[PDB]
Design a protein around this ligand. Sequence first.
Ligand SMILES: CN1C(=O)[C@H](Cc2ccccc2)O[C@@H](c2ccc(Br)cc2)[C@H]1c1ccc(Br)cc1
Length: 85
Amino acid sequence: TLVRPKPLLLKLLKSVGAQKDTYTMKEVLFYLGQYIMTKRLYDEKQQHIVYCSNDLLGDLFGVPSFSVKEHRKIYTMIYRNLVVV
Ligand SMILES: CN1C(=O)[C@H](Cc2ccccc2)O[C@@H](c2ccc(Br)cc2)[C@H]1c1ccc(Br)cc1
């Protein structure tokens, strides 16, 4: 499935090296995760928990924190920031 990230998500992706305007979901996640690990928004003690309050990611998703273990919720939040081609 190819997707087109909306302006805010695209900015996020490109800030960690993304270069296209169109991506597969696996690529969106790849860069999104690189973004998270690069900024280290995860919690050192509980590494599956992500803190993104007052960050671009928080703006994007609409939440102050989330768990990378809830794939359905992450997929939901991501989909709101892209149009499926
Ligand atoms: C599937 N996946 C990835 O592709 C990347 C891999 C990656 C890591 C470092 C540098 C480049 C790419 O991130 C994974 C990830 C990210 C953050 C945490 Br916390 C756990 C796992 C993980 C992931 C990406 C996005 C979300 Br939201 C949740 C998990």
